[PDB]
Fold this protein.
Amino acid sequence: GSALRELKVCLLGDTGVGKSSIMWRFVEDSFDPNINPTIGASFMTKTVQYQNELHKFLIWDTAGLERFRALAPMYYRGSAAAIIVYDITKEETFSTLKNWVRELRQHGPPSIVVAIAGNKCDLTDVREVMERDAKDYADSIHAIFVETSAKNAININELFIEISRRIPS
Amino acid sequence: IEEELLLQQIDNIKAYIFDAKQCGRLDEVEVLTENLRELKHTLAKQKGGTD
Ligand SMILES: Nc1nc2c(ncn2[C@@H]2O[C@H](COP(=O)(O)OP(=O)(O)OP(=O)(O)O)[C@@H](O)[C@H]2O)c(=O)[nH]1
Ligand SMILES: [Mg+2]
């Protein structure tokens, strides 16, 4: 209330990139190879101690399926941070991510914390998006950048720790 | 938003509310109720009742 800081965070990105899998790894420490595409938007929370302070993440997990694109503003508006996810093996998903950045910039404060997650980083042999290029783009928009794997539990915690560090509330 | 999809998400948040009320997380009942209010406002707007 005074001791516990609520942090609204929204996951955005193309269908199939791993938004929900990132959330399930963070919250439930599990991975499902057969998780189904999200309908509408899902919700989970997690209470953590980062930077010697208590935070409760309020995580909105949006559907990336096309018919739900117009629903996303109901979830990203008023968020302290937006996590925009792409798939390192599909360059088109990074182009989609740039469209999400434009959508945020049209509708939210320039001060919103943006994190870019290049997910499925366990799939090293079939990479299409070079890490150097994705990092450089993230820097150009003042975003957090991590390559993640929900499957192999890589950089998921780091992602949320850095979001917490950057939110000035 | 395609109207039926908006109505379905309202039903989805109502399901999250039903579960957060059956448990003990009061702060999340409020968070979810706020989202429900926003979805309902958007629905009323799509029907022309407000701007
Ligand atoms: N190899 C690998 N597969 C992953 C990873 N993350 C998710 N997947 C798989 O990729 C597929 C899509 O993952 P989802 O978590 O449903 O992706 P999403 O972004 O929530 O998709 P929508 O809900 O449709 O927008 C699923 O089969 C997952 O098991 C990952 O880090 N590595
Ligand atoms: Mg999903």
Notes: The CA atoms of residues 2 and 46 of chain B lie 9 Å apart.
